Amino acid sequence: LTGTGVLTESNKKFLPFQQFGRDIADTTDAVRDPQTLEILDITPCSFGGV
């Protein structure tokens, strides 16, 4: 599962069988790391107009 972004530790709980989560827009919100079974949140990299 790929993408570009900033990873932080999450403070949410996944059920034991869930592998990743999604937001209201149905995009990837968070993932379960495959080696350490911890949940990380994915934040888009900052951007804006100039």
Add this chain to the structure above:
Amino acid sequence: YTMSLGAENSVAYSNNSIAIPTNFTISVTTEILPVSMTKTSVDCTMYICGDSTECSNLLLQYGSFCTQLNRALTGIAVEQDKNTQEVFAQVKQIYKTPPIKDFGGFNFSQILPDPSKPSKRSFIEDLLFNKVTKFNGLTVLPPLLTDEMIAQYTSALLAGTITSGWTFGAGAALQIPFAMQMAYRFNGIGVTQNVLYENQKLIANQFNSAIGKIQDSLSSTASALGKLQDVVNQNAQALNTLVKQLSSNFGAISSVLNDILSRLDPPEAEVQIDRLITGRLQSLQTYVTQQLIRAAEIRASANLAATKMSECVLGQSKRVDFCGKGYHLMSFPQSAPHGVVFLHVTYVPAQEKNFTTAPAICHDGKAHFPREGVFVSNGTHWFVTQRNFYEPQIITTDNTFVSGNCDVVIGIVNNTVYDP
């Protein structure tokens, strides 16, 4: 069921009967208008392609479509500040109230700003604010004026209205006692000023009561501010739709640009990308068109709001239903999220009695007409009185004027006129 259009009312019309109010009430009503909407902005390239180089290059085949869409949205966002500025920023100075709130019994403490809060809003304004209530190239620009700044303009308009009447809206603010200001407003609706002074306590009490009713109405009924909530909901829905469209395949193997890119070589990847571009571009164009139409609707509302501020708050209107129902006396603005709320104070006749009337009285062959008011009778004696409030007076030569004689006016009454 078949709906009713209202109760029936047979008016007791006759060629010699007039009904005249002997009492009145003061009513304060609330009118709510949208002024602006969220200044959103959408990046025409990021929405469609993200950070994909291949997609970005394919979009060059469409020329200026990308920039036209951003230009249109930018224009809307600018207009939203223009609308706000026109409605509220129309006072030349920021006026303040005196430290001693002596307004002749009229209590404005619920509409004046509260000095103890971090945001100087009135009690009513706090109620209004409490009741009204994805990253793919989509952003929101802040408004130029902040809520605190709007509150200051509102406060200035209110302070002006209370201490200098409408004068500040034409020239310099010139102080006037509040009760005298009301006297002018009463003459302005056809009611002689002595009516105000002789009933000053009553009028002030009815006013104060009406404000308390407003606080309860707004506190208990969330739906009261539905017009502003509606603007918010429609823009939110349009935007969520734009986002959901990114998940459509439009004939593609996948809606995800990265799934196409990570699996196919360019000679094939481009086919899949091109169809996603067409679909996403069409979806974005649809969004922008709808926002232009919606923006126009809001602007029209803002223009109306600006007009009401000028004609209802900065003066006394003669337009019949323009500044609330009843005869207009004065109005006070309050701010609201993305809009303005007006409190309109009107005079309503409220107890009528059946009097006999006549168009004229003939005395010694001369036809006498009232200068002001009408002639009435209680069944024994004839009096002259002002039209909007029963107050009978002896008919004298200082009340009437003479033109013509007993043989011209239809329905002329045989009586005398007193000469002091």
Add this chain to the structure above:
Amino acid sequence: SALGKLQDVVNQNAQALNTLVKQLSSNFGAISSVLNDILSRLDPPEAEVQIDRLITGRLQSLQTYVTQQLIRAAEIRASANLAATKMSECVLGQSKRVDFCGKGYHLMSFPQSAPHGVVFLHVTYVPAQEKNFTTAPAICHDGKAHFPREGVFVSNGTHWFVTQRNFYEPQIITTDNTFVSGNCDVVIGIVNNTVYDP
């Protein structure tokens, strides 16, 4: 910059039209934006493919243009309706609408023409020197409460006068200036003075 509103209308339409023209140079996936390059080089079974994609692109560009002009046209019409209203209420009469015909009290207006628009010159009256006077809602004389028919009662610190509200012009208070209703015990803040009877 004084006439920026009219210049703005011109600039927006010019920009929209230039955009429509520039779009003719886009390929939209075609080998060439020039219809004649396609026709002079390819046999019909192939030329049609290239032509069809140019048509789709050009048709979409034109539809976009027309939609924008319909929206813009509506904005102008609304302005024209306002202008027509002002001609009727500011030029052909004297308006009572507070900020409708300029700031200050309206006296009269005069139209002037302009490219694609109208310019109004609004003549208004503005009060311009105030002074601080003492006032009262009424004067009681021999138990009778006297109110002005027009104007207000004022005092210069020693004498009371009645004057028109919008321009200081003090007059002796007489029975021809005031009317009587009620007495000294009803009006709040009523002043103790006399009224002259000619």
Add this chain to the structure above:
Amino acid sequence: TRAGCLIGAEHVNNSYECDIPIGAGICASYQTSQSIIAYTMSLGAENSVAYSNNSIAIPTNFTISVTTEILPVSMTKTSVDCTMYICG
């Protein structure tokens, strides 16, 4: 600021009429040695009205003002041929 990161303008804590708007209460202008500055905009001068229960202000003079209001009425009557534009 709340409107973004502003680089090159000098922020001051004075208050001035708005010239070039930035957002969220902030504007910028070029002034006195002349450089771009950023500031909170002023909403106007303050005016404490001398209100009392017995004082009225009355003008003793007036002026005549003439102001200009400009409104658009029409736009160029363009026309586009739906076939020629596309096909020549």
